[PDB]
Amino acid sequence: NYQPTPEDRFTFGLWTVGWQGRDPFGDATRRALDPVESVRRLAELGAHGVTFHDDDLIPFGSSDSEREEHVKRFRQALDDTGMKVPMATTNLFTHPVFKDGGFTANDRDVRRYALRKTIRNIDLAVELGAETYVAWGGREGAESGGAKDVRDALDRMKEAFDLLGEYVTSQGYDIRFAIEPKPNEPRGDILLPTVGHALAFIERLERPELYGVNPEVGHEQMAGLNFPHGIAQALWAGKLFHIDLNGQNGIKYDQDLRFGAGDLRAAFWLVDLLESAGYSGPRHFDFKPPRTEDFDGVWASAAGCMRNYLILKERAAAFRADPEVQEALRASRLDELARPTAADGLQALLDDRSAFEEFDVDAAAARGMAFERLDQLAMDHLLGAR
Amino acid sequence: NYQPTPEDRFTFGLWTVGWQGRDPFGDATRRALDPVESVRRLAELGAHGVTFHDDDLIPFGSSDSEREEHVKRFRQALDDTGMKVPMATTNLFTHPVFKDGGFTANDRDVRRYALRKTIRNIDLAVELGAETYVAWGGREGAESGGAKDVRDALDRMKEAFDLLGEYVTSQGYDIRFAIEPKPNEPRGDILLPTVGHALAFIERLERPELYGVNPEVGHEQMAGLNFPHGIAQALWAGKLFHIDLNGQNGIKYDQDLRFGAGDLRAAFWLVDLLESAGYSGPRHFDFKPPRTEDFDGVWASAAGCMRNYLILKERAAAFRADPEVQEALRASRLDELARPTAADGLQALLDDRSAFEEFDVDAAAARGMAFERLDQLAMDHLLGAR
Amino acid sequence: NYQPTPEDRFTFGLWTVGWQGRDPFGDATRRALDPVESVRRLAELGAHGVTFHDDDLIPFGSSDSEREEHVKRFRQALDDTGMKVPMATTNLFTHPVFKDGGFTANDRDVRRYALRKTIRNIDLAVELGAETYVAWGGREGAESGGAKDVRDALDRMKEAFDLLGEYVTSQGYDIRFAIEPKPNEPRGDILLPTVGHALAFIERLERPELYGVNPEVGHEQMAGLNFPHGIAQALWAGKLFHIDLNGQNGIKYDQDLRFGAGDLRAAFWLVDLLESAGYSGPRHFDFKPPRTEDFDGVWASAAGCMRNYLILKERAAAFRADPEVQEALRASRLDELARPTAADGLQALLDDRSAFEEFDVDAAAARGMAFERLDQLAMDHLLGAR
Amino acid sequence: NYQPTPEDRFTFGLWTVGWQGRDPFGDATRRALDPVESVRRLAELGAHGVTFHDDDLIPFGSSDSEREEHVKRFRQALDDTGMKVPMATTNLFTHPVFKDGGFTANDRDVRRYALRKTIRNIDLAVELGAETYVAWGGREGAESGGAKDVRDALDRMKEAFDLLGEYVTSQGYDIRFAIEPKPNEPRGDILLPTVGHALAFIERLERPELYGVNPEVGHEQMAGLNFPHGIAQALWAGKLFHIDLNGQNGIKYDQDLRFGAGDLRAAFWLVDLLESAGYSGPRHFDFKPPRTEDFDGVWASAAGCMRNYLILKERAAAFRADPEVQEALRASRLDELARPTAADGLQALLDDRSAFEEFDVDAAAARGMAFERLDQLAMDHLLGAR
Ligand SMILES: OC[C@H]1O[C@H](O)[C@H](O)[C@@H](O)[C@@H]1O
Ligand SMILES: OC[C@H]1O[C@H](O)[C@H](O)[C@@H](O)[C@@H]1O
Ligand SMILES: OC[C@H]1O[C@H](O)[C@H](O)[C@@H](O)[C@@H]1O
Ligand SMILES: OC[C@H]1O[C@H](O)[C@H](O)[C@@H](O)[C@@H]1O
Ligand SMILES: [Mg+2]
Ligand SMILES: [Mg+2]
Ligand SMILES: [Mg+2]
Ligand SMILES: [Mg+2]
Ligand SMILES: [Mg+2]
Ligand SMILES: [Mg+2]
Ligand SMILES: [Mg+2]
C-alpha cells in the first residue's frame, strides 16, 4: 500500500524535518535535530538520500577541526544507512552579513565573501558525491526601487555564476548548477523571480550547459503561475536538473506544506508530466512540518510526502493507460498538436489555398474541443472513481 | 505644463480609444469609432502615431477590394496628420475559430490558417512603415491540464515563429518581432506567461536576433511581479523592442487603466529606468477608457496617459540630478554594485585572505544600507516635496 | 455510480448552460439556447430545478404581451418536466444604463429605475414559486477613488434593500433575500466584496431577518480567502440562505469552472461542512462551460458538476464515519474545542490558579496537535486510498 | 516643511522601531532597544505616544517584583517626555504554548490561560491610561481543514470576548476593544480574516457597543481588497476605533513597510477619507524598518511614516478645496449619490411612471460619468502638478 523504497529516489533537506518551527511571529516549538538522527530516521521511512546547506551540517564559525569531525560523523551515518547525498547548497541568507544579498550585495567585499563561502562547500559537496549544486538567491533583491540597479545586479549575478563555472571546470568536477527561483520573501522582490526568468538568465552565462533550474512547486504558485506548465518549459529547454516538491495554498507567504497538500490537481498533473517525460533526478521534498506538530508529526508529515507522490503516480498511470482516455485524447486532437504545422515548408504553406483562400472558417469554429469530457475522466481517475 | 509633442513618441492602439466598452457582463456603452477619426483626434492631442490589429483596420471577411479602400482612407489620414504607424499586430483571438489558439491550436488546419492570416498582415505592416510586429498569444493556453501537452505546444509555437522569421528574411523586410506575455485571461493559463518565459523561449528560436519582448505593465502585475525589474532584465538581454504602458491595481482581471493609475510608484521607477537606459522606442499605451465614460472621457483618459508620463519623467530627472540623492546613492553603495566583484580573477580571489579567512563578518554585517533614507528622498521627489 | 436525482436538489442558472461564450476578447462560440430546451435537457440529467435573471427569460424591452407568452411557455416546460424554480434574481448589470451601478448609481433616476425593475421581477419570482431572491451588485463599485463616496453608497444600498423588504412584507410574500458578494470584476472594486462584508451590512438593515448571503466558491477565492471558513461563519450567523457552487484556480478573473475543478481539497471540505451542518437549500451551480466546447461539452460539463458533488459527498461521509478518523479527531482535541472555555464563569476563572499561577506552560507547549496525521487520513479518504 | 507635533496624534508600537530584524530566513540584524530609549527617541521625532504588547514591556516569565520595576521605569520615561499610551494589546502568538491559538486553541487549558494573560494586561493598560485594547488573533486559524471546526472556534471566540466584556464592565473600566483582522500569516488561514468578517462577528457579541475594529492597511491588501473602501464601511457602522497605518506591495507576505510606501494612491484616498470623516483616534504606525537598516535607518523610517501622512493630508485638503474639483464632483453626480433614492416612499415610487414606464433608458445610458477627468485632477493634486 504505497510504500516507498530507495529506488523511488525520494530525498529530503536536513532543514526540512529539522525545521524547529521559528516563524516571524513565534519561537521554536521543537528542539534541534542532530543531522545523524535525521539521516537514520529518513532511511527507516524509505528515503533515498538527504541534501544540506553548508551551515546545516557545519555550524557557522566552526574551526577546521570541528568541521572535520562534523563531516566524519555525517559520513558514518551515510555508510551505516545506505543514504546518498545527491545535492548540496550554500546558506547565503541567514547570517546578517547577507542582509542585502550574497552575489548581488551592494558591498563588494560581501560579494567576494559569498563566493569564497560557496566554493568551499562545492569541494565538500563533490567529496560527498553530490551531482547537483543548488543556488537559491533568497536575499538577492530589494524592498525599494532605488536600492538596487537591476542591470548592475544581473551583471554581478552573471559574474558570480561564471566564476563558479570556471572553478568547477578548472578542478575537473562532475557537478552541475541549478538555480532555484522564488518571486518574493524574504526580500520584497527577489531577482530571477520565476522559472522563466532563470531560464533566460542561464542563456547569457559563459557556459550555459553547466546550469539548469531547480523549480519549487510553492514558489511558482506564489506568483499565481501554473507549475506543470513551467516544468514543461524547463523540460523542453533541457534544463530540469532537480526539483523541489511541496504544497502551497495560493498567493501568500511560502507555506512549504507537505507534497500533495495545497493544489492537489496541480500535483496530479505534475506527477503525470514528470513520469511521462522520464525525469530521472531526485524527487526532493523542500517542506516544513507545521509548527503545531511534535516529532511524531514531523515523521508522519515526511512519510505523507512520499505516500502522496506514489498515490498520484498510480492514478496518473491509470489515466494514461485507460483506453477511454486514449480515445478522448484523440477526440480533443492531442495527436494533431504533436504533428508539425508545416513540414511541407513556407512556400508550400503560402501556395496552399486550403490554408486560407478556401479555408472554411465557420466549420472549423463549430468543432467542439471535447476538453470537459477529457477533464472529467481525469477527475474520475484522480478520485478513484475509475 | 506637461504638453506632449510628436517627438515624445507617444503612440496608441486603434483598439484603445476605440474600445466600445463591452465586458464579460455588459453591452457596449459607446459607438464604434472610425479609425480615420481616431487618427485625427490623437494627432490633435499630441500623439506621435497609432498601432493596429489587422481586424481593427479591415473588417474580418472583407473582399480584396474593400480591403484596398480601407487602407487608402487610413493612409490618407496618416498623410493629412503626420501620424506614423510604428507597430502592427494580428488578431488571433476574437474569431471563434481561434477558441483553442492560433499558433498552438490542437487542430492543424487552424494553425496553418493562423500563420497565413499573420503573414498577410506583415506585408501590410511593412507597407505602412511599421518597424515592430507584435504577437500576443492570448488564446494559446488551456483551462485544464489534459487539453494541452505544453512541450508539443512549445514545439508548435517555435515552428510558427521560425516560419515567420524565414518569411521576413526571404522577403528582405526590415521588421522585428516582439512577443507580448500575459499570464492568464482569456485562457485559464496562457503559454509564455511572463517576460522571463518569453525571453527564455526566444533563445531557442532559429534566428533569435529577430525577436524581442513587448512587456505590458498590467500583465506582469497580474502575476504580482515587479514590472521595472522585469524591464531591467529585458534591457540587460538587449530585447526590449517595444513596451505597452497602462495601469493595474494588483492581481485581478486585466484592467488596462490609463498609465499612471494603478501602482504609481512602480510607474515612477519604470519611467526612471526607461529614461536612464535611453530606451528610444515608442511609448505605447495599451489602455481602455472605462466604460463609464462618454467620448469626452475617452479623450481625457488618453491625454492623461501622456500627461502622467511627462510628469513622472520630470520627477525622475529631478531625483537623479539632486546632489543629495547622488550622495545617498553612494551612502547605499550603488557605486560599488556597479564595480566587478572579482576583476582580479578566480585564482586571485581564492588567494585573497581578506575575502574569507580574515574577513570581518561582524563589522560588515553592522553596516546599515541607508535604503530608507534614499527611498524617502525618492518619495519626496515624486510628490514634489523637493 | 454517482447518478443524481431531483432529491439531491441540484439546480442551475439559465445563464450557465446558456452562456454563449462571449468573453472580453472574443465573440460567441455557441448559439443561444431556448430556455425551454435548457429546462428539458437539465431535467434529463437529473437536475431538480433552474434559476433565472429577469432578462434571461424575458428579453429586455419586451411588451407586456410578449412577456406573458414567454412566461407561459416556460411554465409549460416546468409542468412537463417537474422542474422547480427555487431562486430568481434581477439583471442590474448588462444594459448600459447600469454602467455605474443600479442601487448605488450616482444618478438618482437610475437608482429608482433599478428598484422598479427589481420589484417587477420579485412578483414574477413569487408567482413561479421561488423561495430566495438573490442580489448580485456586480456594477456597484468603482475604478477610481473619487468616483464613489462609499459611505453615501452604503446609505443608498441600505435604502434600496430596506425598500425591497418593505415591499415584500406589505405584499405578504414568503420570499427571503440573499446578497451575493464578489470582490471585483466587472468593476475595479465591488462594494460588499466578501461574505464578511455582506454579513456585516445585513445587520444594519431595518429587517435583518429577511436577508442572508449567497456566497460563491470562486468569488471568495478571488480574494485568496478560505471558502469553507467563510461558509462556516455564514452558518454560524444563521445566514446561509443559498450557495453558488463552481471552481476557480486562484486569484485571477472569475473563471466559473465546473464544480470540483479548481481547488479540489477546498471542494471536499466544503461538501463535508454542508452535509455535516445539514444545509438543506439548493445546491446551485453558477458555472460557465468553457467556450472551447460545443453543446455536447456543455451537457458533459453540467453533468460533471453533479457527479463531483456526489463523489465528494461519499468521500466526506466515509471520512467522518471511519473509526480511525474519529480516534484522530480526539487525538487533535477537536472534542475539547467544542467544550466551553469557562462555563464556570468569570469569577471562577479569575480564582482558578491552574489557569495561570500554576499553569505549566512548557508542558502544554510540548503537546503535539497531531494535525498532519489527521490531514493525511483526509487525503487518503479523498483519493480513495481508504 | 511637514514637521509632526504631538497634536497630530502619531503613535508607534514598541515592537515597530524595536523590531530586531529576525525573519523566517535570517537572524536579527539589530540589537534590542530598551523601551525607555524608544520612548525618548520617538518623543524627539514628534510622536504623540506609544503602544505595547504585555511582553514587549515585561519580559515573559517575570516575577511580580521585576514586573513592577519594568513598569516604574516605563512610567518615568512617559512622565519625562509627555508621551501617552493610547492603546495596548496582548501577545498571544509568540510563546510555543499558543502554537494552535489562544482564544480558539483546541486545548481548553490553553484557552483559559490565554484569557487570564489578557485580563492581567487589561488592568495594566487601564492604569497607564489606554483607551483602546486591541486583539490580533494571529494564531487563531489552521493550515488544514480538519484541524479546526470553525463554528466551534467562533463559539469559543465569542465566549472569550464576551468574558472580556463582562470583566471590563464589572470593574467599571473605560476601555473599548478593537479586533484587528488579518487573512493569513502565520497561520495558513486566520479566523475573521478581513474588516468585514470582524464587523459581522461583533454583532453577535453580548455587548456589541464595546467592540470595534483596528484595520491595518497591509492586511486588507493581502487579500487584494480596497483598504479605503473597507475603512468607509467601518466608519459607516460606527466601529473604527483605531487604525494601523503602513504599506504593502500587493498580495504576498505581510511587509509592514513604512506608511506611504506600497500603494501610494490608496494612501492618498485613505488620508482623504480619515480627514474628511473627522476620525479623531490615534494615527498608529504598525511598521517594521527593513532589516537592511541600522539604527539611523530605523529613525529615518519612523520619521518618514509621519512625513508622508502630513504630505498626503496637505494634498488631499488641496484637492477637496479646489473649485475645479468641486465642479467635477458635481459633473460626476457625487451630489446626487448623497441624496435619497426614494424619500417619497415605496408607494410613490411604485406610482411614479417616470421611474419605469416612461423612463428613457437610452438617454440615461448615454450620459458619461466624467470619472476619468475627476481622477486626473486627483492625480495632479497628489503629484503637486496643481
Ligand atoms: O537553497 C536551498 C533551499 O534554501 C532555503 O532553505 C529555501 O527556503 C529553499 O527554498 C531552498 O530550496
Ligand atoms: O496584441 C496586441 C494587443 O492585443 C490585444 O488587444 C491585447 O489585449 C493587448 O494586450 C495586446 O497588446
Ligand atoms: O446574480 C446572479 C448571478 O448573476 C450574474 O450572472 C453573476 O455573474 C453571478 O455570479 C450571479 O450569481
Ligand atoms: O496585536 C497588535 C500587533 O500584534 C502583532 O505584532 C501583529 O503582527 C500586528 O499586526 C498587530 O497589530
Ligand atoms: Mg518554499
Ligand atoms: Mg522554498
Ligand atoms: Mg526550495
Ligand atoms: Mg492588458
Ligand atoms: Mg493587455
Ligand atoms: Mg498589450
Ligand atoms: Mg463567478
Ligand SMILES: [Mg+2]
Ligand atoms: Mg460569479
Ligand SMILES: [Mg+2]
Ligand atoms: Mg454567482
Ligand SMILES: [Mg+2]
Ligand atoms: Mg502587518
Ligand SMILES: [Mg+2]
Ligand atoms: Mg500587521
Ligand SMILES: [Mg+2]
Ligand atoms: Mg497591526
